[PDB]
Amino acid sequence: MENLKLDSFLEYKFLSNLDFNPDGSNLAFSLSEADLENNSYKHFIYNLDTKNKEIKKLTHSGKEKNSLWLNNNTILFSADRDKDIEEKKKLGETWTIFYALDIKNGGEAYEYMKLPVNVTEIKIIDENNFILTADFDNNSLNLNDLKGGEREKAIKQIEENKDYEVLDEIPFWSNGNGFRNKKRNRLYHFDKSNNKLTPISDEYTNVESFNIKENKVIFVGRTYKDKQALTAGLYTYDVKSNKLEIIISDNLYDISYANFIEDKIICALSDMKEYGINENHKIYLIDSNKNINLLYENDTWLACTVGSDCRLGGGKSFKVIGNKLYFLSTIADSVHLSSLDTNGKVEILSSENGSIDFFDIANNEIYYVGMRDYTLQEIYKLENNSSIKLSSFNEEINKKYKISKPEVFDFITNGDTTKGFVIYPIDYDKNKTYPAILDIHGGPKTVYGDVYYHEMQVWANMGYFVIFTNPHGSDGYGNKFADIRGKYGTIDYEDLMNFTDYVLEKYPIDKSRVGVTGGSYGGYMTNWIIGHTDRFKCAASQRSISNWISKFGTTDIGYYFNADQNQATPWINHDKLWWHSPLKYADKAKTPTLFIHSEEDYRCWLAEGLQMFTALKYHGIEARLCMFRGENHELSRSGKPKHRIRRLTEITNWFEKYLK
Amino acid sequence: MENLKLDSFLEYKFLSNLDFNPDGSNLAFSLSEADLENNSYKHFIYNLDTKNKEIKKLTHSGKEKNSLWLNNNTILFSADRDKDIEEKKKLGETWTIFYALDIKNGGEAYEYMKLPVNVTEIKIIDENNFILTADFDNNSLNLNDLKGGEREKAIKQIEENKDYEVLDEIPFWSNGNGFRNKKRNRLYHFDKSNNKLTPISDEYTNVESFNIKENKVIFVGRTYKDKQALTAGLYTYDVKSNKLEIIISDNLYDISYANFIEDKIICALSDMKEYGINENHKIYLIDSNKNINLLYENDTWLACTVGSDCRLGGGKSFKVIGNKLYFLSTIADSVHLSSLDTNGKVEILSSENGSIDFFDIANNEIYYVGMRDYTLQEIYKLENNSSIKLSSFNEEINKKYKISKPEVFDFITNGDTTKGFVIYPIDYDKNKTYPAILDIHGGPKTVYGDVYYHEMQVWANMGYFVIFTNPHGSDGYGNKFADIRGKYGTIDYEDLMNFTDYVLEKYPIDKSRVGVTGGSYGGYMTNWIIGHTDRFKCAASQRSISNWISKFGTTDIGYYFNADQNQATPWINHDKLWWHSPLKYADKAKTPTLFIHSEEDYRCWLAEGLQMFTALKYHGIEARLCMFRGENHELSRSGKPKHRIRRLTEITNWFEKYLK
């Protein structure tokens, strides 16, 4: 082998967009890989034949991801191979060009469609009919329709308007998407036959999800003019009657999935009365007369929440075929693939140890991408609760480099039993003593698992122990285990400190050289940890939360997600919201702390990292902060390659200065 | 008589850099005017022959400000007329080219000097020796000295470094200067004969003031590696012996002015023990034994603090000549010009109603630029406490547009008699009724005066009353009147509301239609007002403060100034610091409020504006926020023309929408 290095992730391959053709013969997917020279990513389109089992590389310029199957022969994708349209978009025009790539009859990609909107997702009624969600600006100048003097007047106004941002609704930006004031994700119908682009959802509605069966659309709708509500409405629309029908009013529940199943509608849904915003959605059925009836009392977040920094892109996590609804659920450190028929029978289909990222089903043949055996993403076919490995995109990674696989064990703390993980240092000697790093998984209701994580292997290849666990608040063990509302920094902080106590005694680690790092919620805990204990000699706080009050007014979810998680508000029990803020305890922090933060991170605003850094510096504590431009919360998982190398370098150099 | 329009300031002229030549024969100065088409400002160098008062324009390209007098016939200025140097600056090289313009012999400017640093201020000893302060970076790659392969790697490293910012000091940025982490304002001596540039201040000292007599240098020092202190250091440098000498340590006093006088040193100091950071500086005399003897117990902020938006640049507020020290002092409504001889005697040389922006003296001849009789900037000569107007760059403005001059009266409140102002609406009728606008000046210890203020005149020309005053905390009545430490929102809020009630009774103002607005501390009070009263039907909060614990960690001055003004701290009496924050009362805010804020404002950072807006939108109140890119706290005074028009238009349409 050879030592894994900081930048070794440049050679990793990431899979996305697993989609079948209607006849189940060919399934398409995309491969992404780092492009260090251009600080971007190359995206290729691939195909596997379901009976030949042969992988085929379809694109080679590196700017194409498959979005849709036109028919069993032809994959459609969006690109920018029209230099005229490209320069029009720079001026302010909105356009999306789709091409077509014959596999059965061959050739190269040829232009199939031009659509005068910027599309976010596309689905197919037939060859000349598509259902659309796309960016829509209520203050758009409509540069496509303008000509003459009014055109040059708009080109200048659009250019000048880049120097401002106007805000008059309480979520004025979204992380990963920039400023979003008075702009919505709107649903459209496009008829290629007559080039007619027909709106479905109105001007103020954010379409969060949509599905189609034949000529009928079902979508999720959040609508607001000044304040986004916690509830979403369910709506349907037919592309022949042009009738919109309110299925569920927009002030009852927050729905996560809705689709057609047989002659009625299945829907994940919750009124958030028991466990708040993040309550696990139960699955109901909606009959013809719009009655809601329980079908299966699920107690899981219906998604793969196993953390990793070796993913780029995604696919389907829900599917409806026949009478069964196939879904995902993270159960402990792993993901399950289960079904649910219209009778309520829950069969479990895949309870393997690794993560299931996304999947597709065609003729009761199940294909998925996942991370098994602590290896990177590969395509597996599912047969009788066991997986056959088809692709070999990342097989040499584990054979080329020295990977230290975690030691999984059960850990008891605070009346419940969770998972504990300890990664040995490379070339481990029981006669020596080593330093360690405690990694706290970002997001409260997420999961650490036996899944290849690059940043941990990097430090294990440099002589570090890397330990981590899933404290109270993580996903996996239902709403009860995840409920830490009003308990931030208590039973979860105990869980982490109890885990650190157990590890530094059971494993041979120098207690005097222990670091701690974490992002998002993990960055909050790092700021909390350094303000309550002296046991870590250095810390790294990334995209963190330091001031719940300051975070209330500057976060894309802050004005409602803070009140739900801390049971407080800058005006109702302010002392509680301040008690849970790590900035309050910054005058007792003595631990040197590096701060990673992104300027366009709107899930955790720059103010949070700026405050803890200033506080430690005010009290004469060594500190450091690296601000990343053009990046956001997703820097560690999907940022530009150089900015990922810079983040990994800053974090790796800080431990080296204080732990070696 | 035409109506003054919103964009009428595009026709104003602004003077700066009033500077004598060594024999008092000529007076150089710069004129500045807005260039809307290029969204910038043109600058021209003028001359004034002191014998017959002839005004001459000397440069015409629009990119020149006068720096020094090379001799009695030549002005020295910096510009960019070398395209090779211009492109090397874009790559990373530090350069400044100085051109010489012979006013007597004629011709155009010719290149005189080239210095491999970015110069922030320059002074001349003789025609071959100069004292500089210039930008210095402790992490500079020194691209000027690099060649070959190390150059191409440094160029790319400089370009890639633009994506990040590294912080490891508690003042890491300065308003109007961007990020300043580990960058200092360093003093240099440049010998033009042998092209030697020699440092004087060390690699970590911020030089904030310096003066020269013969071949000696006096300068002021702020030195820090991790935390800028409140005290400054006074040192001296001889350029022949290369001798540096500490005459006051940097841990004793804060100093505002320091200069050579006769055979000793005159200096403005203070131990901030009686009134804090903003304590008025006494003027002391330092003998050759480095003993510091009191010369005059000055009780003034030795500067011009009369606010106005019709200035661009500045000049000299101090001048030592013979045995006297001529200085400015805002006495209450206006700016005086006094003198102080080494015997301790104070003479009042100017005590007129307007403002004195900056001056200069030669052979008992005192010229200055000032705003008198509610007219824009003009050059005046001062003789026997009365001024003679020598320029008319803006004389047509008051003759062509409808200017409503203020009515000034005495106004007692909270045991002190301050000034009150009311500007009538244009075409005023005694029997009709009008809406009003409250303007609160921005710097806590500054002053509103009988000085042309554009935004006030724009609103009066649209049918508004404009009212403003000087509450407790303002400049112009000694320390005691300016002492609102720990009193933010108490007496200062009462004095404004007492003034507003006074004006609403005497004048025919529709109390139903009264707007309020202000920036900086006037933006804090606007945020304070809407949370503590509903009497204003609409508000406009510019570059405001809303959350003191938030401003502590995210502001160039917040970690020492906020504790000085509120006598609190996020960790010491936090209840008090949270009390003086207007965000605490946002739940009681019912007044629709517009928010003006800039992205690169580091005096009141973006977090303050976002929190008040999100809080008001959270409570169902109408609110609007306009964010300005590329501008800072000085937007309303020196921002780019289009952005100044946008801010004015944003505020005006807000008043128009709710007050009409």
Q: Which of B323, B328, B314 is nearest to B366 (CA)?
A: B328
Q: CA-CA distances (angstroms) from residue B255 to A173, A327, B227, B587? A: 45, 70, 18, 43
CA distance B169 to A614: 8
Establish, for the pair of chains A and B, how many residue pairs have beta carbons separated by less than 8 Å.
Answer: 153
Residues of B in contact with A583 (CB under 8 A): 549, 553, 570
Preferred mutation among A167, A547, A610, A625 to probe B, highest tally of B CBs within 10 A = A167
Do B559 and A612 lie within an 8 Å CB cutoff? Answer: no
Residues 6+ apart with CB under 8 A from A69: A19, A20, A21, A22, A28, A75, A76, A124
Residue of B607, B617, B624 with shortest CB distance to A550:
B607
End-to-end CA distance of chain B: 25
| Amino acid of residue A569 | T
Q: Which residues of B touch A169 (CB under 8 A)?
A: 617
The per-residue b/e assignment along A161-187, b for 16 or more CB within 10 angstroms, e otherwise, is: eebbbebbbbbbbbbeeeebbbbbbbb
Neighbours of A206 (CB within 10 A): 22
With CA atoms as reference, report the closest residue to B562 among B543, B549, B546. Answer: B549
Q: Which long-range contacts (CB under 8 A, 24 or more apart) does B528-531 make?
A: B528/B488, B528/B489, B528/B493, B528/B582, B528/B585, B529/B493, B529/B496, B529/B497, B529/B591, B530/B582, B530/B589, B530/B590, B530/B591, B530/B593, B531/B582, B531/B584, B531/B585, B531/B586, B531/B588, B531/B589
Provide the chain B residues 562-601 that lie in CB contact (below 8 A) with chain A.
Answer: 570-571, 574, 578, 583-584, 586-587
Q: SS3 of A51, please?
A: coil
What is d(CA B298, CA A464) in angstroms, rounded to the nearest whole number?
A: 63
Q: Can you state the angle between helices B606-618 and A558-566, rounded to 10 degrees?
A: 80
Residue in chain A lying closest to B157 (CA): A642
Give the three-state DSSP class for B83: helix
Query: Rounded to an integer, what distance in angstroms lies between the CA atom of residue B66 and that of residue B456?
Result: 32
C-alpha B525/C-alpha B483 separation (Å) is: 16
CA distance A318 to A182: 30
Cβ partners under 8 Å of residue B479, min gap 6: B274, B275, B279, B280, B299
φ, ψ for residue B303 (rounded to 5)? -170, 175
Q: Do B617 and A547 touch (CB under 8 A)?
A: no
Which of B618, B619, B625 to mutate against chain A (most A CBs within 10 Å)?
Answer: B618
Please report where in the chains the tokens 């060390």 appear, as a residue: B202
Which residues from B are below 8 Å from A592, CB to CB?
none
- The packing angle between helices B558-566 and A606-618, to 10°, is 80
Could you tell me which of B520, B552, B517 has the C-alpha nearest to residue B537?
B517
Angstroms from A180 CA to nearest CA on chain B? 13
Q: Say how far apart CA A644 and CA A653 lie, in whole Å.
A: 14
Dihedral sign computed on CA atoms, order B64, B66, B69, B73: positive
Could you say which residues from 529 to 568 on chain A have a Cβ atom under 8 Å away from some Cβ of chain B?
547, 549-550, 552-554, 558-559
CB contact under 8 A, A549 and B547: yes
What residues of B are in contact with residue A595 (Cβ under 8 Å)?
A: 167
Please judge whether B629 and A163 are an interchain contact, meaning their C-beta atoms are less than 8 angstroms apart. Answer: yes
Name the token pair of A615: 């506080």
Closest CB to B550: pick one of A550, A574, A578: A550
Cβ atoms of A565 and B626 within 8 Å: the answer is: no
Instruction: Please give the distance of CA B524 from its chain centroid, rounded to a whole number.
Output: 19
B549 to A583: CB separation less than 8 angstroms, yes or no: yes
Task: Specify the residue for token string 């909060």.
Answer: B541
Q: Quick one: which of B368, B378, B420 has its CA closest to B398?
A: B378
Distance (Å, whole) CA A110 – CA A423? 50
Q: Are B44 and B60 in contact, with CB atoms under 8 Å apart? A: yes
Report how far Cα B182 is from the mean position of its chain's Cα atoms.
24
| DSSP notation for A223-250 | E-SS---S--EEEEEETTT--EEEEE-T
All residues of chain A having their beta carbon less than 8 Å from the beta carbon of residue B553 are 583, 607, 610-615
Q: Give residue A398's Cα distance to chain centre.
A: 25
Solved with: X-ray
Q: Which of residues 295-314 of B touch A (CB under 8 A)?
A: none
CB nearest A554 (choices: B164, B614, B627): B614
Of B168, B227, B614, the CB nearest to A170: B614
3-state DSSP assignment of residue A278: coil
Report the candidate in B8, B11, B37, B29 with the shortest Cα–Cα distance to residue B640. B37
**Cα separation, B470 vs A345, whole angstroms:** 76
Q: Which residues, at least 6 apart from A657, have a Cβ–Cβ distance to it below 8 Å?
A: A538
Report in angstroms the alpha-carbon separations of A400 from A9, A137, A168, B138: 13, 49, 54, 41
d(CA A607, CA A550): 7
Do residues A174 and A184 touch, judged by C-beta distance below 8 A? Answer: no
Q: Chain B within 8 Å of A37 (Cβ-Cβ)?
A: no
Q: Which parts of B441-537 are beta strand (E)?
A: 465-469, 509-519
**B158 shares contact with chain A (CB less than 8 Å):** no
Q: State which residue of chain B sits closest to A169, comparing Cα positions.
A: B617
Quote helix, strand, coil % in chain B, to nearest 5.
Answer: 20, 40, 40
Place of tokens 């009193």: B487
Identify the domain containing residue B601 by its residue range.
396-659
Judged by DSSP in three states, A304 sits in coil
Distance from C-alpha of B574 to C-alpha of A330, rounded to nearest angstrom: 42
Contact flag A170-B584 (C-beta cutoff 8 Å) = no
CA distances from B155 to A136, B93, B413 (A): 40, 10, 62
Q: Are B25 and B49 in contact (CB under 8 A)?
A: yes
Q: What is the DSSP letter of B447?
A: B
Identify how many contiguous H helices and E strands chain B contains and give both numbers: 13, 39
* A235 in Cβ contact with A207 (< 8 Å): no
CA dihedral for B647, B653, B658, B659, sign (positive or negative): positive
**Residue A387 backbone phi and psi in degrees, to 5:** -115, 140
Task: Give me the torsion for CA of B533, B539, B544, B545, rounded to 10°.
Answer: 20
Query: Measured between beta carbons, which residues in chain A are less than 8 angstroms from residue B614?
Result: 170, 552-554, 558-559
Residue B261 identity (one-letter amino acid)? I
CB contact at 8 A, B32 and B41: yes
Q: Are the beta carbons of A627 and B549 separated by less than 8 Å?
A: no
- Which residues of B are less than 8 Å from A613 in CB distance? 167, 553
CA distance readout (Å), A40 to A34, A63, A394, A625: 6, 10, 20, 24
3-state class (DSSP) for residue B173: strand
Instruction: Tally the residues of chain B.
Output: 660
Q: Which residues have a Cβ under 8 Å from the Cβ of B489 and sit 6 or more positions away?
A: B525, B528, B532, B580, B582
Alpha helices in B326-483 (DSSP H): 395-400, 454-460, 478-481
CB distance A247 to A290 below 8 Å: yes
Residue A159 sits at the chain B interface (C-beta within 8 Å): no
Residue A523: phi, psi to the nearest 5?
-65, -35
- Strands of B65-71's sheet, edge to edge? B65-71, B74-79, B96-102, B110-115
In chain A, the largest separation of any two C-alpha atoms, in whole Å, equals 81
Show contacts of B493-498: CB within 8 Å, 24+ apart: B493/B525, B493/B528, B493/B529, B493/B532, B494/B413, B494/B414, B495/B413, B495/B414, B495/B418, B495/B469, B495/B471, B496/B438, B496/B440, B496/B469, B496/B471, B496/B525, B496/B529, B497/B529, B497/B533, B498/B413, B498/B414
Distance between CA atoms of residues A499 and B587, nearest Å: 42
* Cα-based torsion angle of the residue sequence B559, B564, B570, B575 in order, rounded to the nearest 10 degrees: -160
Nearest to A659 by CA among A453, A462, A458: A462
Backbone angles phi, psi at A154, to 5 degrees: -75, -40
A628 has a chain B CB within 8 A of its CB: yes
3-state secondary structure (DSSP) of residue B350: strand
Q: Name residue B230's amino acid.
A: L
Amino acid letter, residue A78: S
User: Rounded to a whole number, what is the distance in Å from the CA of B266 to chain A's nearest CA?
Assistant: 34
- Contact assignment for B617 to A226 by CB distance below 8 Å: yes
Separation in Å, CA of B47 to nearest CA in chain A: 37
Residue A608 backbone dihedrals phi, psi, to 5 degrees: -65, -50
Of the candidates B575, B226, B560, the residue with the CA atom closest to the CA atom of residue A616: B226
Question: Which residue on chain A is closest to B551 by alpha carbon?
Answer: A611
Tell me whether residues A570 and B584 touch, CB distance under 8 A.
Answer: yes
Closest CA to A436 of A444, A447, A428: A428
Q: What is the CATH number of the domain that holds A567?
A: 3.40.50.1820
Using an 8 Å CB-CB cutoff, list chain B residues near A165. Answer: 626-627, 629
User: 3-state DSSP call for residue B397?
Assistant: helix
Distance from CA of A603 to the nearest CA of B (A): 14
A635's CB contacts (< 8 A; 6+ apart) are A543, A596, A598, A601, A628, A643, A644, A647
B477 CB-near residues (< 8 Å, 6+ apart): B332, B416, B418
Residue type, position B36, single letter: L
Tokens of B606: 């973006």
Sign of CA dihedral A138, A143, A144, A150: positive
Buried b (16+ CB within 10 A) or exposed e, A405-444: bbeeeebebeeeebbbbbbbbbeeeeeeebbbbbbbbbbb
Q: How close B116 comes to chain A (CA, Å)? A: 29
Structure tokens that stand for A390 in this block: 């088809």
Beta carbons within 8 Å of B194's beta carbon, 6+ residues apart: none
Q: Contact, B190 vs B132, CB < 8 A? A: yes
Q: Structure resolution in Å? A: 2.6
SS3 A156: helix
Task: Judge contact between B190 and B130, C-beta under 8 A.
Answer: yes
CB contact under 8 A, A578 and B574: yes
Tell me the two tokens of residue A632.
């956001």
Residue to substitute from B571, B624, B632, interface A, most A β-carbons within 10 A: B571
Nearest to A115 by CA among A188, A31, A184, A46: A188
